Amino acid sequence: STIEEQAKTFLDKFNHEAEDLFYQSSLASWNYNTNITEENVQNMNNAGDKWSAFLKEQSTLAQMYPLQEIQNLTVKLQLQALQQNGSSVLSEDKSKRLNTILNTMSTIYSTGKVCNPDNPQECLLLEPGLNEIMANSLDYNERLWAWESWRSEVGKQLRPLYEEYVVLKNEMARANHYEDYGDYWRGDYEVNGVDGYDYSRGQLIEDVEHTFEEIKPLYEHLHAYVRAKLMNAYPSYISPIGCLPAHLLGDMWGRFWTNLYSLTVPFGQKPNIDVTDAMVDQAWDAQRIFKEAEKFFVSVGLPNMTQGFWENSMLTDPGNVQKAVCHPTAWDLGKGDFRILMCTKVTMDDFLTAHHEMGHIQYDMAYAAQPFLLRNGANEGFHEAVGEIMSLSAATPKHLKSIGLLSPDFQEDNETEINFLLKQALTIVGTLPFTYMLEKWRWMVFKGEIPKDQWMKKWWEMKREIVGVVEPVPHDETYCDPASLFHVSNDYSFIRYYTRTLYQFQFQEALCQAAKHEGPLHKCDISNSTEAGQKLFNMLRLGKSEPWTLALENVVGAKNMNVRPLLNYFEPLFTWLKDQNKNSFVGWSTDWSPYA
Amino acid sequence: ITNLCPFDEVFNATRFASVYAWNRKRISNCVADYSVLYNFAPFSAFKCYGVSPTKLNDLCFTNVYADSFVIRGNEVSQIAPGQTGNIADYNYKLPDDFTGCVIAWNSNKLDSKVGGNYNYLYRLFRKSNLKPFERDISTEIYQAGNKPCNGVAGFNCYFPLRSYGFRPTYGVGHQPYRVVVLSFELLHAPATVCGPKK
Ligand SMILES: *[C@@H]1O[C@H](CO)[C@@H](O[C@@H]2O[C@H](CO)[C@@H](O)[C@H](O)[C@H]2NC(C)=O)[C@H](O)[C@H]1NC(C)=O
Numbered sequence: 001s002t003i004e005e006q007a008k009t010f011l012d013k014f015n016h017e018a019e020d021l022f023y024q025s026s027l028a029s030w031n032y033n034t035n036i037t038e039e040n041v042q043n044m045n046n047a048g049d050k051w052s053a054f055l056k057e058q059s060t061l062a063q064m065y066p067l068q069e070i071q072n073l074t075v076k077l078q079l080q081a082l083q084q085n086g087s088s089v090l091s092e093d094k095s096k097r098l099n100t101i102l103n104t105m106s107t108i109y110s111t112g113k114v115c116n117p118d119n120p121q122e123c124l125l126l127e128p129g130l131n132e133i134m135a136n137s138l139d140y141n142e143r144l145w146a147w148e149s150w151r152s153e154v155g156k157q158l159r160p161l162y163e164e165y166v167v168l169k170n171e172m173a174r175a176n177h178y179e180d181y182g183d184y185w186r187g188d189y190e191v192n193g194v195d196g197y198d199y200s201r202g203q204l205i206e207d208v209e210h211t212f213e214e215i216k217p218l219y220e221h222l223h224a225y226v227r228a229k230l231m232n233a234y235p236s237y238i239s240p241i242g243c244l245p246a247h248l249l250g251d252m253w254g255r256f257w258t259n260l261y262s263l264t265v266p267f268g269q270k271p272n273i274d275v276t277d278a279m280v281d282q283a284w285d286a287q288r289i290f291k292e293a294e295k296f297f298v299s300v301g302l303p304n305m306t307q308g309f310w311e312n313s314m315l316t317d318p319g320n321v322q323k324a325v326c327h328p329t330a331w332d333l334g335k336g337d338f339r340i341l342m343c344t345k346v347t348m349d350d351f352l353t354a355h356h357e358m359g360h361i362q363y364d365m366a367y368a369a370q371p372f373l374l375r376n377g378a379n380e381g382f383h384e385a386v387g388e389i390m391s392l393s394a395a396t397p398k399h400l401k402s403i404g405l406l407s408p409d410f411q412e413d414n415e416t417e418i419n420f421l422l423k424q425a426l427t428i429v430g431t432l433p434f435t436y437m438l439e440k441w442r443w444m445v446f447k448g449e450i451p452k453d454q455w456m457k458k459w460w461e462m463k464r465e466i467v468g469v470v471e472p473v474p475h476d477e478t479y480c481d482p483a484s485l486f487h488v489s490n491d492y493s494f495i496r497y498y499t500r501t502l503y504q505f506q507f508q509e510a511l512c513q514a515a516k517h518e519g520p521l522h523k524c525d526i527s528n529s530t531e532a533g534q535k536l537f538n539m540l541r542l543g544k545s546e547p548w549t550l551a552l553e554n555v556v557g558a559k560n561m562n563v564r565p566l567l568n569y570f571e572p573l574f575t576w577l578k579d580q581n582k583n584s585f586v587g588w589s590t591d592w593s594p595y596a
Numbered sequence: 597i598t599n600l601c602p603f604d605e606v607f608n609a610t611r612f613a614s615v616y617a618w619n620r621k622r623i624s625n626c627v628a629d630y631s632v633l634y635n636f637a638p639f640s641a642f643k644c645y646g647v648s649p650t651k652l653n654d655l656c657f658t659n660v661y662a663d664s665f666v667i668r669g670n671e672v673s674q675i676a677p678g679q680t681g682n683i684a685d686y687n688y689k690l691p692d693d694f695t696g697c698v699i700a701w702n703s704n705k706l707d708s709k710v711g712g713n714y715n716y717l718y719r720l721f722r723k724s725n726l727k728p729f730e731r732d733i734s735t736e737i738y739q740a741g742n743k744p745c746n747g748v749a750g751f752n753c754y755f756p757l758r759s760y761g762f763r764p765t766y767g768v769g770h771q772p773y774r775v776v777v778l779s780f781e782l783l784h785a786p787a788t789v790c791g792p793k794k
Pocket residue numbers: 299398399401402403408525527528
């Protein structure tokens with residue numbers, strides 16, 4: 001008699017139908033990914049097409065419930081998730097144009113090659129073949145050639161594509177009751193209906209910036225140290241007072257400064273903890289690695305792995321007569337089907353990635369009890385953060401010393417934690433300014449403070465200020481530098497990594513406070529701590545059934561994204577950098593450029 | 597000993613019924629060997645809500661009913677007095693004064709198929725909850741809405757029966773489970789079924 005109960009009945013039907021079709025689609029996708037063949041592709045495409053058609057039919061059926069008279073948070077949230085129009089709101093011509101634009105950008109990025117006028121038979125793609133130049137070469141001129149060629153052949157050719165993309169996506173968002181496509185992306189964090197836990201779409205902009213003004217000291221000192229470690233590598237090319245040239249960062253776009261570790265290592269004599277030799281001497285296999293991972297997860301208090309996970313998952317490469325995807329992934333096929341897809345080798349990195357993926361699977365198992373639409377992380381940044389804290393706590397010396405990979409005689413001299421924290425900061429805090437600046441630039445482009453006449457002019461102006469990276473060549477408006485990245489020209493939000501990076505350390509510090517940790521934060525192991533496991537599981541089992549602020553309060557104790565745990569993690573490194581930065585300028589001046 | 601009950605047929609039957617069309621077998625007059633109730637050694641749940649299983653083969657009743665069907669793994673807990681859910685409400689309801697046993701065992705190897713065993717049904721939608729020990733096999737369009745359905749399954753007009761699509765790769769909570777519930781009717785009549793004469 002009321003809309004709220006008809007909606008409940010419709011959701012009851014939809015949950016079962018969607019669960020069936022989603023399981024079929026996921027099973028087809030898994031069968032393709034482990035058994036790359038010809039018929040598997042057709043099976044996967046048919047399952048995906050059926051799932052998409054069913055989803056569209058249910059979406060157009062759910063519009064008849066106005067959602068205004070549904071005074072139940074769960075039903076209203078499920079219908080709101082199911083009622084999204086998406087690209088089906090514009091004209092058919094405009095939707096087809098947008099789809100073609102997206103497909104063209106994705107293909108041209110995938111098929112992106114480099115042309116060498118010196119030798120026509122020197123074509124390289126973004127595949128690691130080109131990546132060794134931007135990750136291992138020690139030549140300024142060669143790195144400049146690679147950078148300029150990539151920005152000239154791919155970046156210049158994606159300018160009008162992105163220009164029309166912006167207009168089409170803005171029209172889509174405005175037709176979807178959003179002032180911007182950037183507003184559409186910021187809607188992944190919006191919470192309404194529950195008092196005290198309300199969180200606004202625009203409130204993200206003033207929070208991400210607010211947590212970035214407290215990152216500037218640590219990142220500035222890290223940038224100063226890294227720069228100081230590059231004049232010796234690149235003489236008369238770094239200009240200590242100036243910024244870091246764009247093509248010397250150990251990466252194509254400077255997203256992670258991971259490859260700079262071999263050049264900016266604090267103490268060369270002391271090595272890093274590498275238990276790969278120990279775990280290959282002790283006759284370890286992939287099965288043993290995953291058994292140790294579930295032993296860790298049981299010790300912290302979470303349930304062990306399902307019996308069907310051990311027989312259905314693919315943990316070792318079947319590459320005798322077969323093909324598969326080397327990407328380590330965690331699969332929630334639905335209806336109690338959990339799997340892990342990775343070609344595990346005997347390596348410490350494989351150990352950490354196994355911990356991370358099994359953390360993903362544990363989160364999936366935790367929220368598997370929720371309805372189909374509410375079976376996801378409370379926001380886009382919880383899956384990856386929850387997975388990352390597992391590898392964060394797995395790599396500590398007191399965990400390897402316990403499981404036997406590190407013999408119980410290791411001495412942790414204070415020079416080694418500096419190396420570890422600097423290596424981890426070159427990856428973690430070295431990407432926060434880039435992520436923040438890229439997402440801010442893309443938001444401003446979408447909403448409109450950046451005209452098409454000044455797309456490049458702002459992009460470097462931000463890059464010379466927010467992240468302290470200076471371009472080596474004066475790119476004109478023909479180029480499109482912030483379109484060469486994988487995520488930007490693929491319909492992917494990028495602030496997810498920023499929020500994930502902050503949530504990682506928030507969760508880690510919360511579970512350390514629950515585990516009665518004593519020393520510094522980077523030496524934390526949450527094993528054998530059922531309190532930390534229970535505290536984490538309280539948030540894990542929620543799924544999307546509760547606002548992400550409430551879920552964050554269920555572990556951290558504060559309903560806001562805080563950067564203080566991140567600064568607490570790198571506090572010894574921050575002190576060492578502050579001491580080491582003496583007799584060297586800290587910061588950068590934007591009024592410098594290598595070309596001038 | 598040549599009066600054995602047909603239990604060895606109901607437990608070992610090669611075709612169990614759907615939960616909405618659960619099959620009732622009347623054990624009328626023969627020697628009830630309740631100690632042979634171990635056809636499937638790993639019974640998932642053999643729970644007696646009346647006389648204890650040790651004393652089971654001692655009492656004499658006038659009639660026994662065996663209600664057999666197949667349900668989901670997490671839906672086994674709904675086969676109990678005073679339970680709620682799809683099975684208890686719309687498919688199979690046990691009275692709070694139930695006197696008998698519930699024997700559920702996993703049958704993943706039997707009632708599952710690689711492509712999906714769409715042979716078991718359950719009533720997802722019903723106007724009102726079932727009364728204890730009464731069935732509803734009708735397939736009539738459930739009028740969730742207010743406009744008359746006219747017997748056409750469309751908007752706000754749902755077909756009441758949904759299929760358990762069973763696959764061997766499911767989790768133990770979604771794998772098939774064969775359930776036989778024995779109700780021991782003791783009435784104002786001579787007790788025909790008796791225990792073994794051991
Ligand atoms: C968690 O507890 C376990 C045992 O409860 C400990 O790990 C080792 O367990 C073996 C079992 O035979 C024993 O040698 C010791 O109990 C432990 N060895 C060492 C060197 O500690 C350990 O306390 C914890 N394991 C971790 C943190 O990985």
